[PDB]
Design a protein around this nucleic acid. Structure first.
Lengths: 156, 882, 76, 373
DNA sequence: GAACGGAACGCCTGCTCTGAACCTGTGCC
DNA sequence: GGCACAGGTTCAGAGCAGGCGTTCCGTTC
């Protein structure tokens, strides 16, 4: 569903931009609701499904949202920032999922870790590219992420 | 399989580390030529496949990239194997040699959109081996002649060299060719005219020395009348005649009395033979102007050049009677009336301002080159006449003063617009032999009878730096194309003799006179004659090793094996570089040092890699890098490249990479802003200025070459499944450069190509480790293993490299210190790639470590820490911007 | 002069032929002494299939040379 | 007219463009003297601006030209093209050229025009490549004409380095719903004398098209062989049959199926043409151990319908030979040979059964029943 | 013993290698 | 303060390798 959404242009009306951002926000909240069911259903096939379709969702978020955020940033900045801080909340869950698949050394899970990792790093760097093309490149901060499990701990 | 064999052999010969481990197995090239050698026992089902392999190899891998090393050197070598297979098949199987020859001729004719140089080499080899066999293809050859107006000039000029053993034998085909060429002269396409002159000059050349001789002396006198058409045609068609007549006279002597007449009448349309009319040449008839289209026709300079050369040849070899005794007086009158012409006679410098938009400026610019060429020919002629008479050397100096006046007038007029006028850099009409015998007489004549006349030329330094520059232009012209311009200009033995006799004088002037004797200032310090002799030495040393590669024995005899002579020639430049380095600091000669390093680089390739002279050379270079500071960056880059090119042929250069990384770490800083390091003691040519963009990229490039060799070893090991020394060597190499990568990861590199090349070489490092692990998967499942080497390497990769990669990535991203929008978007989408590619390569290393850890019953994942991951934030800087 | 012919069952037969004789003469001799029909016969020498219209002098067959006979059954 | 036609060998280089102007002075004076002046201006030395002008003066009146003038005109047009005016003049030429309103002198002058176009595309890649790139840019409209088939076959035959690009253009053009049977029938029915040179190029294109998937492509690969056998000479017919036996004896299941379908269509179309080459069709009996039993049925059907035409009973050699090979196949103890013998016997009896023929099918059925008992 | 996950042969996308030309930055006149 | 040389950059092209799509055998409860 989410791959079929097209980014517009700056020549397009702001109403279509606003409805597209609402449409993206709906997809992100649905993705978070779907991903959060991992914690109570831990098994081989449910983890396999979210590992494959998580990266397939993030790649669609990369190809067909980020041009819309590049277009509509000077007008709708708060929506874009809210969208990104919403997407971070399950990107973190995907990172913990990759960790969980490494720790319990499960081959059938671990085969989908490196392309997911590459895709989340692409997401970070693409956000930096967004701020570069919107002339706020010196606002892009970074910082490490605490190593949690699926429930949420600090495994150390 | 043949191209992979050649890439194996090149990469295996490139390094000593690979030759220590691998004992050389037979390559697929020598197998296929063994097959052709063994086909004499004549099972002839094979031979059709050998012909088809040979044509596949020549078709696919012909020079079309060449209208490098990776795409160049294993794709000349496959094409030469193809022509070699076809020629060896031809020299054995007498049945085949009508379907080889037709297939070659089918590719020479229908093509010549694509390059066909390899096919015209194969055709020449085939024909020169057995010229009778072209009588079997008399049908197909005569239907190539009907298209010898549409082919380009290079095809025609070499196909007609090949064919003519038919035309000595045949008579009908000869009278077909002359008919084709005579009807081709009246074409409209440009190539047809020059193809016709190439055919006429070849038929004049090799079709008798003087069948019946009475059936030749008239027959060339037929062709010669046909050539009086071409002299009426346009400039390029003339110029091919003016350059060809000297070879025609050399190979066919008795045409001399005709040929000179053909020139002399051609001179008389442009020479005004009345004294006290001051411009002695008619340059207003050598310019064709119609419809605002301005063209040069009848290049008078090359005509005088050809007249001079044929005249000197006639005087030299024929005589031991009226045309040449006239021509001496013609050239002498041209000399004496050219001396006392002061540029108002050619309407120059004051009535003209040489503007290349107006027709008059273009005309004046053409006539300028004309008068410069005329003066050059007369310089050569006045040198030729007398055995060092003082009057004619003053004449030479006055002619050169006229030449230099026109030259610096064109320099003043080229100082306003862009420097695209490469027509001023048009080749001199001095023959290579003359510039040899002029520089020899200028720098190495001590005979007291000559010395009074030579002191006229040695007094004027501009003449010296003209007559050196001209020989530099000649050797540069041999570098670019395989032949030089003048007479005996395509005859490689004469070019070798003149390169030996240029080397002998340039070495003498560089050696016997240093650079510190100068009295000249900065303007002439940029172009001091010692420096130009060193530059010509650098171009000669380079251009011998391309072409005169078997003769590098004899070339050194001109100046005991190749190594002793090369070492003795190395030591002079070695001492000269030491004297230039150690002495001065203030404003030291960057250019002279830089191309001394270039000379030593070109010279070090002739030493044998196990010789003691090679070892003392490498030791000297290492000591120079260990001692001297030398703040200039390009000179440092040239020295390190010389050091690495010396070092990799001796042993694997990973300890040197480690030491240079430690010096970069010591110099540039550190990520954490508080770690105290300094280890300058290793290598002295490393500065705050130098090491950051220059030594960093160079050491990373050498790391990539080490990783390529290691990956090739691993891929070869994966073929088989003898083993244990190879794996120990691989693991030792990988551990060393793992320490190397560690020091550069921690370093505070600049935000340019240095950080990007590091990230790309880290992906290449991890990929190589991933390929090692994935090889160990294949072995350790069979027996039980991962010996202590591999475990220690995994431990080292987990402890030292990986978490530092993570902190380095955080350093790169956190560091943040007018844009066309499309290119800006292209830039940022380029820059979003190499960090993800490094993350992928790390995670795919760890995943194959998991695979190995499962199916070996040893937990290699207990060494590495949990993967660190990164989240972004955005701060309150956006309120300042918007 | 004498040659050998070896077939697929390892049977070796000695043939008295002159190099002036053609190949179908040799096939006729195999038909006489072994009964194998000449259209089914296929002769191989030094990795060369012998053609019908030639002779032994075209294929450089000297004394005591060894031919290989295979049976080309079209269908079976 | 003789003085005009002799002008290139007479005049020197200093007097071209003057006679460049004055010949054009004669060009507007008479329409009866268009073509020798056009050949002379094609062969003299001229500046390209005047050549552009006279090319426009030719190109506006292209439809008012009978076919006899059309070679020496079109040669002039293909040697007045600049490096920048390639696609424009090629598109205008391919638009304006009819080749139908002109249609014994006509066919000969058509062959002369195609000779001229082969000579123009042989040694100048800038016209061949721009002609191919000016055909796929008319993929939109389904109304492109006979010319664009014959020209693709010509450029495929002549230039070797553009073979892969022509192959890809033909595949992506036939998958677009463009060039189909109704073009190919008109091409091979009208332009059979021009294409009769390029038998081998046509059969190479057919061989390259039969190897793929997408039955619309393999339909074209079959119909090319069909029309090549229909219109060409006996030598090209022999080469067609050779290519078909090559596809059967070597290729995969789709290739064997298609080639056997083609042989069936050609024996049902022209048995007398196949009777000359019937030994090459007999040559498939060596490879019965490589062919699927359904294709064995089809092979025996095509062979046995070739053999049992009424007028070809003078040529009874094949009729006795396949009877021999059936009785040979049946006389084997091995089941794999007996299977092929039974199949061949039944299909052979079926085709020969449409008083002595009743005795013949009696003997055949009794022997297969006796050995198969 | 069954079912579900690991494994091989072919075609498409994209990525990288490389060259060519433009252009811009720096140094010397 | 401008011109020339160098080096970077960017775009255009081309070729091939690896990853996904179908199809079958190994492995784990």
């Amino acid at each position: 569903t989410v791959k079929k959404i097209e980014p517009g242009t700056a020549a397009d009306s702001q109403q279509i931009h606003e409805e597209k951002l609402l449409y993206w926000n709906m997809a992100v909240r649905d993705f978070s609701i779907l991903i959060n069911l991992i914690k109570v259903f831990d098994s081989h096939p449910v983890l396999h499904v979210c590992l494959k379709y998580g990266r397939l969702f993030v790649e669609a978020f990369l190809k067909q949202c980020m041009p819309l955020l590049d277009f509509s940033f000077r007008k709708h900045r708060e929506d874009v920032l809210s969208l990104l801080e919403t997407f971070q909340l399950d990107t973190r869950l995907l990172h913990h999922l990759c960790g969980h698949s490494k720790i319990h050394q499960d081959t059938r899970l671990t085969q989908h870790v490196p392309l997911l990792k590459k895709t989340l790093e692409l997401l970070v760097c693409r956000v930096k590219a967004m701020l570069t093309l919107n002339n706020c490149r010196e606002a892009f901060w970074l910082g490490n992420l605490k190593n949690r499990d699926l429930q949420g701990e600090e495994i150390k | 399989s043949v191209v992979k064999s050649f890439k194996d052999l090149q990469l295996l010969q490139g390094s000593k580390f690979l030759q220590n481990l691998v004992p050389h197995r037979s390559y697929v090239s020598t197998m296929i030529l063994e097959v052709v050698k063994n086909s004499v026992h004549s099972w002839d089902h094979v031979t059709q496949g050998l012909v088809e392999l040979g044509f596949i190899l020549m078709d696919s891998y012909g020079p079309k990239k060449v209208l490098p090393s990776l795409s160049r050197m294993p794709n000349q070598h496959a094409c030469k194997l193809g022509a070699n297979i076809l020629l060896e098949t031809f020299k054995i199987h007498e049945m085949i040699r009508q379907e080889i020859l037709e297939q070659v001729l089918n590719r020479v004719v229908t093509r010549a959109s694509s390059p066909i140089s390899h096919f015209l080499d194969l055709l020449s080899n085939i024909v020169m081996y057995a010229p009778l066999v072209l009588q079997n293809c008399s049908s197909k050859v005569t239907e190539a002649f009907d298209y010898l107006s549409f082919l380009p000039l290079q095809t025609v000029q070499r196909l007609l060299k090949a064919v003519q053993p038919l035309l000595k034998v045949s008579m009908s085909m000869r009278d077909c060719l002359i008919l084709v060429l005579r009807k081709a002269m009246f074409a409209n396409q440009l190539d047809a005219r020059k193809s016709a002159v190439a055919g006429f000059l070849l038929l004049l050349k090799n079709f008798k020395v003087l069948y019946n001789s009475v059936a030749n002396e008239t027959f060339c006198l037929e062709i010669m009348d046909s050539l009086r058409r071409c002299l009426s045609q346009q400039a390029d068609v003339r110029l091919m005649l003016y350059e060809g007549f000297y070879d025609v006279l050399r190979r066919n002597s008795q045409l001399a009395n005709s040929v000179m007449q053909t020139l002399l009448s051609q001179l008389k349309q442009f020479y005004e033979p009345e004294p006290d009319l001051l411009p002695p040449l008619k340059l207003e008839a050598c310019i064709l102007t119609q419809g605002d289209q301005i063209s040069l026709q009848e290049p008078l300079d090359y005509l005088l050049c050809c007249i001079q050369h044929c005249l000197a040849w006639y005087k030299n070899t024929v005589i031991p009677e009226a045309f040449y005794e006239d021509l001496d007086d013609i050239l002498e009158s041209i000399t004496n009336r050219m001396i006392k012409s002061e540029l108002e006679d050619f309407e120059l410098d004051k009535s003209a301002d040489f503007s290349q938009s107006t027709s008059i400026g273009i005309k004046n610019n053409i006539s300028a080159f004309l008068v410069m060429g005329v003066c050059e020919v007369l310089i050569e002629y006045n040198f030729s006449i007398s055995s060092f008479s003082k009057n004619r050397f003053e004449d030479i100096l006055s002619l050169f003063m006229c030449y230099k006046k026109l030259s610096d007038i064109l320099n003043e007029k080229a100082g306003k617009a862009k420097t695209k006028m490469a027509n001023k850099t048009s080749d001199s009409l001095l023959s290579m032999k003359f510039v040899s015998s002029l520089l020899t007489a200028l720098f190495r004549d001590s005979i007291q009878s000559h010395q009074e006349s030579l002191s006229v030329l040695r007094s004027s330094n501009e003449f010296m730096r003209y007559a050196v520059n001209v020989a530099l232009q000649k050797v540069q012209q041999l570098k670019e194309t395989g032949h030089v311009s003048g007479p005996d200009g395509q005859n490689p033995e004469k070019i070798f003799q003149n390169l030996c006799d240029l080397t002998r004088v340039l070495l003498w002037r560089y050696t016997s006179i240093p650079t510190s004797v100068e009295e000249s200032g900065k303007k002439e310090k940029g172009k001091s004659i010692s420096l130009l002799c060193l530059e010509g030495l650098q171009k000669i040393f380079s251009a011998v090793q391309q072409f005169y590669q078997p003769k590098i024995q004899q070339f050194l005899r001109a100046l005991v094996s190749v190594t002793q002579r090369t070492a003795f020639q190395i030591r002079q430049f070695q001492r000269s570089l030491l004297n230039l380095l150690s002495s001065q600091e203030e404003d030291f000669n960057s250019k002279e040092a830089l191309l001394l390093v270039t000379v030593l680089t070109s010279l070090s390739k002739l030493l044998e890699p196990s010789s003691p002279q090679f070892v003392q050379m490498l030791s000297w270079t290492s000591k120079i890098c260990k001692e001297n500071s030398r703040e200039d960056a390009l000179f440092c880059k040239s020295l390190m490249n010389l050091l690495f090119s010396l070092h990799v042929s001796y042993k694997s250069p990973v300890i040197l990479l480690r030491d240079l990384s430690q010096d970069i770490h010591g110099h540039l800083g550190d990520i954490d802003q508080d770690v105290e390091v300094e280890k300058t003691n290793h290598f002295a040519i490393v500065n705050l200025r130098t090491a950051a963009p220059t030594v960093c990229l160079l050491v990373l490039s050498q790391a990539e070459k080490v990783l390529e060799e290691v990956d090739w070893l691993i891929t070869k090991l994966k073929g088989q499944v003898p083993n244990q020394p190879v794996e120990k060597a691989i693991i030792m190499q990988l551990g060393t450069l793992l320490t190397f990568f560690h020091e550069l990861v921690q370093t505070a590199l600049p935000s340019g190509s240095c950080v990007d090349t590091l990230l790309k070489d880290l992906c290449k490092m991890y990929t190589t480790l991933t390929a090692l692990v994935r090889y160990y998967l294949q072995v350790c499942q069979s027996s039980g293993g991962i010996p202590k080497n591999m475990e220690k390497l995994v431990k080292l990769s987990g402890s030292h490299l990986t978490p530092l990669c993570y902190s380095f990535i955080s350093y790169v991203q956190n560091k943040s210190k007018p844009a066309v929008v499309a290119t800006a978007m292209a830039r940022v989408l380029r820059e979003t790639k190499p960090i993800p590619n490094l993350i992928f390569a790390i995670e795919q290393y760890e995943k194959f470590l998991i695979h190995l850890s499962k199916k070996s019953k040893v937990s290699l994942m207990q060494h590495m820490k949990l993967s660190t991951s990164r989240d972004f934030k955005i701060k309150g800087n956006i309120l300042d911007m918007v | 002069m004498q040659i050998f012919v070896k077939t697929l069952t390892g049977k070796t037969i000695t043939l008295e032929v002159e190099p002036s004789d053609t190949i179908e003469n040799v096939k006729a001799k195999i038909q006489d002494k072994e009964g194998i029909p000449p259209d089914q016969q296929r002769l191989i020498f030094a990795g060369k299939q012998l053609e019908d219209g030639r002779t032994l002098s075209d294929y450089n067959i000297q004394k005591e040379s060894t031919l290989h006979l295979v049976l080309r059954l079209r269908g079976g | 007219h003789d003085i005009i036609t002799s002008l290139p060998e007479i005049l020197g280089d200093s007097q071209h463009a003057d006679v460049g102007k004055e010949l054009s002075d004669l060009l507007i004076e008479n329409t009866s003297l268009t073509v020798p002046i056009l050949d002379v201006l094609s062969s003299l030395r001229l500046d390209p601006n005047f050549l552009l002008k006279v090319r426009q003066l030719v190109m506006d009146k292209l439809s008012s030209i009978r076919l006899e003038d059309l070679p020496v005109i079109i040669k002039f047009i293909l040697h007045s093209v600049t490096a920048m005016d390639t696609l424009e003049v090629i598109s205008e030429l391919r638009e304006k050229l009819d080749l139908q309103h002109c249609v014994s002198s006509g066919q000969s002058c058509i062959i002369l025009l195609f000779d001229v176009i082969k000579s123009a595309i042989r040694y100048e890649k800038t016209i061949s490549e721009a002609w191919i790139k000016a055909i796929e840019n008319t993929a939109s409209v389904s109304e492109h004409k006979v010319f664009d088939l014959v020209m693709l076959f010509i450029i495929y035959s002549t230039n070797t380095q553009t073979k892969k690009y022509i192959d890809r253009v033909l595949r992506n053009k036939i998958r677009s719903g463009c060039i189909q049977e109704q073009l190919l029938q008109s091409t091979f029915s009208v332009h059979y004398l021009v294409l009769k040179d390029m038998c081998s190029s046509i059969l190479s294109l057919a061989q390259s098209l039969l190897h793929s998937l997408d039955q619309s492509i393999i339909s074209f690969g079959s119909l090319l062989y069909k029309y090549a056998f229909k219109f060409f000479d006996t030598y090209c017919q022999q080469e067609v049959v050779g290519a078909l036996v090559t596809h059967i004896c070597s290729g995969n299941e789709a290739e064997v199926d298609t080639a056997l379908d083609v042989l069936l269509e050609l024996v049902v179309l022209n048995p007398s043409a196949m009777m000359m080459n019937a030994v090459f069709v007999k040559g498939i009996l060596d490879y019965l151990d490589n062919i699927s039993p359904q294709q064995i049925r089809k092979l025996f059907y095509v062979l046995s319908t070739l053999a049992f035409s009424k007028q070809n009973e003078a040529s009874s050699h094949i009729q006795d030979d396949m009877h021999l090979v059936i009785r040979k196949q049946l006389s084997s103890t091995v089941f794999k040979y007996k299977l092929i013998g039974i199949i061949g016997a039944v299909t052979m009896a079926g085709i020969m059964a449409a008083d002595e023929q009743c005795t013949q099918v009696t003997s055949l059925l009794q022997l297969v029943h006796s050995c198969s008992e």
